[PDB]
Scaffold this active site. Structure first.
Site, short mmCIF file in Angstrom:
data_model
loop_
_atom_site.label_atom_id
_atom_site.label_comp_id
_atom_site.label_asym_id
_atom_site.label_seq_id
_atom_site.Cartn_x
_atom_site.Cartn_y
_atom_site.Cartn_z
N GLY A 1 1.67 -2.29 -3.87
CA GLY A 1 2.48 -3.03 -4.83
C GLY A 1 2.91 -2.24 -6.07
O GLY A 1 3.06 -1.02 -6.02
N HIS B 1 0.54 7.43 0.48
CA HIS B 1 1.90 7.98 0.34
C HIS B 1 2.35 8.10 -1.14
O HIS B 1 1.67 7.61 -2.04
CB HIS B 1 2.91 7.13 1.14
CG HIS B 1 3.18 5.78 0.56
ND1 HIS B 1 3.94 4.83 1.22
CD2 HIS B 1 2.83 5.22 -0.62
CE1 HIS B 1 4.05 3.75 0.47
NE2 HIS B 1 3.39 3.96 -0.66
N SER C 1 -1.39 2.34 0.16
CA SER C 1 -0.80 2.73 -1.12
C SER C 1 -1.70 2.39 -2.30
O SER C 1 -2.83 2.86 -2.38
CB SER C 1 0.57 2.06 -1.27
OG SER C 1 1.35 2.29 -0.10
N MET C 2 -1.20 1.58 -3.23
CA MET C 2 -2.00 1.21 -4.40
C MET C 2 -3.32 0.56 -3.99
O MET C 2 -4.30 0.60 -4.74
CB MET C 2 -1.21 0.29 -5.32
CG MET C 2 -1.97 -0.13 -6.59
SD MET C 2 -2.76 1.25 -7.54
CE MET C 2 -1.35 2.20 -8.02
N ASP D 1 4.12 9.17 4.87
CA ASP D 1 3.06 8.20 5.14
C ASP D 1 1.99 8.85 6.02
O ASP D 1 2.31 9.61 6.93
CB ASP D 1 3.59 6.95 5.86
CG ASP D 1 4.56 6.14 5.02
OD1 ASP D 1 4.45 6.15 3.77
OD2 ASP D 1 5.41 5.45 5.62
#
EC number: 3.4.21.92
Lengths: 184, 189, 192, 193, 184, 186, 193, 193, 178, 182
Positions: A59, A113, A88-89, A162
């Site tokens: 996000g 990523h 991710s986050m 990714d």
């Protein structure tokens, strides 16, 4: 509804046990709720561990950083547990937990990523915002290097595109400390 | 389906075709790929009909896509005849650029027309690595455009750079004085 | 743009729409909102007729609620630039930029039909962005407004002060009142 | 099924002949549907072309309209009175509001209704939005437009201005026979003879 | 949001410890809620400090000024803490906290710039509104000079276009007094 | 900030209502205006002698809705003290100036904006006259009421409201829209 | 349409052409905008026509395009190489992605860039949705297409396969003089001889 | 405007043809984009016209299509086999699904692929919504359609029915040389004679 | 005082209804962790009526079921398809049930992507890995061989209650309260 | 608009009354199943009353209610008010023998399953075969509960068929009509 003659809703009952849930995409309001829960628990008992369960696709970066800085600031150790996925986050907040206390469940997965963004306007303003997201990218790669033990060069190398990691691969990469399989 | 409005003569021949026989081309509205290709085709045609006579390009535009406008610029510079530019109504952004690119000595503004100059506009969306490649590119485009504006007006590169950071309007007389155009057209002889 | 006017096929010429046929009478129509493309068409017709014959008068019929200022100015400047006098006639209404183009016709050759109406007012606009840019654009519309008032005074014979005063808010004028004000020279009633 | 083409018999020479262009050659103009600027401009252009072709012969204007914009209709009204030829008017289907005004504006003695046509008259409609000062300026103007239209209707029908005012406060329908009695048209057209 | 964590007044609980959160876009209703919480706390005890956490991208200027004036009006000192980000009106309210009690967490960021607006109407009205936004711009630059200690000319210079500041740069500039890293 | 209760059974606004404080926020319209009128009637009942405090941050809104608040302010026994925070524009400015004389305030950086009535209608010419005439009557009553509360002459009000006019806190005191500025508690 | 018509004089119906059709007569073809099935078929038809009109004279293809659909562009590519005439390509404005590929596919020694034109190159884009088994079949296919396109760019530019692959993983822009040096085009065109 | 034209009105023999009408005179027909009833009908009409002008000469069908409606494609297939002339097919860009079927249905020895063209084959797709009884009726019909298409594919390619059935259960791509060894086309066209 | 679902939670009953997604799955995980803390020994009953859903969301439930101390007994009512069928068979051996007229459906993973060829390959590789994992776990819980599971899941496959028992998907059929 | 005395429905649940109203789908069906399990735990010997007013809906959702009704210990009495159509008519006839009722002016409607799919021919075959198996099982259960022969049910459900309260009694869909408070 979920209540049970024990307390209020089911999430409030588990908070009593120092358990917090981070679910879905990261954004300002759900992040503020997590920050509030962490501060409350620290006030209740600054010595006991806190448990943060994570199942998220990622996000907004600044919203995620409000959580990260709170985790490091408070007295208690924040133990992290990945279930489902941490992308991710989400993967960043997972590796940011207390050393030795970061875990993955057997069939969960992690994906990392680089930062994504965008802008529109005058060439002079585009330069200003482009330089800023490049600085954000450098800081995130550095924090990842420090928490995983990997070299800054390997992190940059691994985040360009990714990259997926199974639970065992995440332990070997230094993302988490171990795999949880059966209670006790 | 597309045939409508502009059509006076067997539903094909119009007023614009009439004026083209007299070497006049109109650049009107926002600049984009298809309207630009039409203007290029008209220039190549006229050059073929006679490579020595002047061509007149009337301009009334708010600007538009940079690559499409550069197709017109390069064609104006490539062909043999001189291209005289005339501003009516307004010549802004890519429109002011094409006006000043006309044959030296043959660039005009009508009495109450206006010109506006400024820097490139853009936008991108994606990974940080790609944002860098595209931001770098638009900065090179900005520099290129500033250099060509310096060459055509006679102003220094440093002067052009300071005047285009933000929108700047110029009346007809101010445009003559700045070197954008050569003179004002008021009453036919 | 639909009625194909021609002769009884008794050996004449090519076929042409109603508007192209009236263009041979040196007549041009300005209808609806003023905008870039309809304005460019009017300019092309003026340039064509000047080339055909630089001495004969051109007639511009106007029925418009107004429109974009820069598009109207491309027409104004062409009218003053070409050799022929451009006579103007108001039918229906001439509002805002339409009223401006009506008064800009050749002196002694500006008319209103009996039940026509004219409306005058000041420039309309708008911008959105940083304060510094809002300032640049607000300054520009004030200049535009100043030049428009200056041209209106010149064509009506009225003082700049009177023009500024009467264009702050919308102001309607009947055919007779437009003659008194200096917007038109006289009223056309029956073919003469 | 769009525009019928007829090129035979009365031709021999040039082609291109739409159904409406052929009738224009016979001095017939059609005013159909809602009245607004562009269709009104087309009617004005046809009237000017026919006057240029022959300034003495009558022009026939067929009308089937629910009405429309007043200024657009006045462009047709003033053109009708200005040109030299008489403009005969013929209502088919219906002539309402601005349509009825144009029907009654035809040359005296040459205004007609087909037997089952219908006419309707009423007062002007409008609307504005803004500051109170601007609202008074626009309200004042529509009242003036109203007064001028009632004065012109009184003049063409022969009715007193008081009667026109009372009859147009609300919608009022008239059959062809009632339109002749009111003075809106001169007679009814039944069979070509 | 997150579907569960607050349930039984997590925010009301923290209000009891004199903590208030300003999150997301600044507008009239969320601002009035912050003003009411400040007036309530003052009444409960006009002596104790209040803590205002900030994570916002900015918003409506008049709404933000209702919060600014209230902050200066009440008896209690208002300590400000930026987490995540504080941009535009968010940055302004961060610098407006009590002298010596304005903080940034380690990885938070700030961004400052000039006012944005827009109008549509007659030339006479456009002039009136253009003049008002230029006066608003003058006033905000003057208050930023006052709170940062920078000269008015330096503030005008740095706010013509978007300008980003890391946490250490915000301390150096005078926007905040220090950085909070670890409890204790 | 999200506060479901400055107690547990009392939200943040109910608590302050106990201290006789009411908030008028956002656009003025029938339902929010009715909620304000109810709070005023309730407070009068609790104690008809004590002052009521109305905080105002509004861009304005519907005239008739605003007049239900204005008339209630004048009708009840207690004085209604008004306080502008953020902005008070159009009907918002009118209600600010309608507070009890001597008890109308502006915070240091708030702004006020005044102008004339806005309206619109569609229909037959006869009805357009009826409605145009009415909005003109409304405009004259509003100008007469602004003169009374500010002290300015009717002529002056009429000239200053033809077009939008902004006033800073200090200018609102000189004009007579409010009585003084508030900067620091006691 | 908004397209100008070409006519000699008013010699009572002489010639009626179109600006684009007129230039086709001189063997010039325009490739403008996004590349897709229908606009591509039209270019193929003009090429087949020109070769049938004269199999020996050169054909000129002006390109100003952001690119588009790969299979559509390949129909133009195979046609260019198949016909007898040499196809000279000239870039004006820009030639990106499939547009760049077709610009470099022109006849060796007859590929040009105007002074301020720009070129951009990158790799194929795609997407699918379905069962894992079908996902495999379609991913496998875009990779084979990626490999083929790279081999052809290497053949037309002179660059080694490795350099092409490296330079196309991500967007890469080139100015006119840089395209000449890269081997994408042969030289620049500044002023008519 | 959009579609180019050649040969305008001239002395005596005028005749103005567009780009596609011009190529039809040389017996060339284009099949492009998705196959559907109206575009299919246009192809059938061009084939019947060419048969009428000269029943002994070959017809050339250029194909660039992703496929489409089966019954529409079958109207083209049956017309190809019915008329007396041989129908030669050429694939440019892609021939997928029904497009690949019409490509292989060309006259034996006269079916070609360009070097970088692509082919894709698979089974029928469909759907329905309604009562169980009606669902059975429609399901049975698509299975019969599937069987008939597999039998015709086997007939034209030379492959056994068993091989065709196994290779079409899921999407299957073939490059031009693979299409040749499969029996889908007869050879590859590279450069014109 | 208490809604119907909270009353049944008191009896260690949890419902999994409708499409599987992150939030509803998180609610299920929280209920399991709550019941475990109340009594780590007693069985938990999970009723399932679902068409399936997001794999990662479903896997959070699967891993939790295995991790906690108590046995999780599963009961299929209505239907258990795709991820729903997977969670039904993941129940404690000997405690997995189907009501008489319930239906089960199994198949392979579904997905999709859009982008540069390089990224497409990365995502295609990952979904093929997910497919292998899921097939391995289905083999383990049903007792069938891997090659057999691979063959039966290439295309949608339906199983009535009796066929699910024969296949080893559930342990028995519940018909009337004992 | 709704919610009386804060749960008039909870109050009736105390008297062992459950309402099935509107379209049948997963979530509303699950609430009915939960209410039945709750009442059984409260008292496994007493009857439960299920009022039905529904146009039908999703088959798998309705079957979860059907199997729970047969699984639990208490008899489930069914009562039709307004209408019981499709899956609603099915759940009505599924109540305890001798305890299925219709109010005087209610009506019932029966028909065959409806569905729809889209995809490859091979997949269309798998799904069409499944809905035909569903249709057969539903006809066999209707025959068992009504007493009609399987062939009579198959013939009568090919197209929509309406039945008044007395016709439903004659068909064996319900046991009797309830007219006045006993």
């Amino acid at each position: 509804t979920s209540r049970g003659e024990r307390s209020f809703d089911i999430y409030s009952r588990l908070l009593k046990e120092r358990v917090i849930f981070l679910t879905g995409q990261v954004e300002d309001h759900m992040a503020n709720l997590i920050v509030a829960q962490m501060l409350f628990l620290e006030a209740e008992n600054p010595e006991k561990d806190i448990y943060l369960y994570i199942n998220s696709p990622g996000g907004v970066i600044t919203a995620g950083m409000s959580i990260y800085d709170t985790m490091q600031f408070i007295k208690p150790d924040v133990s992290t547990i990945c279930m489902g996925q941490a992308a991710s986050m989400g993967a960043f907040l997972l590796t940011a937990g207390a050393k030795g206390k970061r875990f993955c469940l057997p069939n969960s997965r992690v994906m990392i990523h680089q930062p994504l963004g965008g802008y529109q306007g005058q060439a002079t303003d585009i330069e200003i915002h482009a330089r800023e997201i490049l600085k954000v990218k450098g800081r995130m790669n550095e924090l990842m290097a420090l928490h995983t033990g990997q070299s800054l060069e390997q992190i940059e190398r691994d985040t360009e595109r990714d990259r997926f990691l199974s639970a065992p691969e995440a332990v070997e990469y230094g993302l988490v400390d171990s795999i949880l399989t059966h209670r006790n």
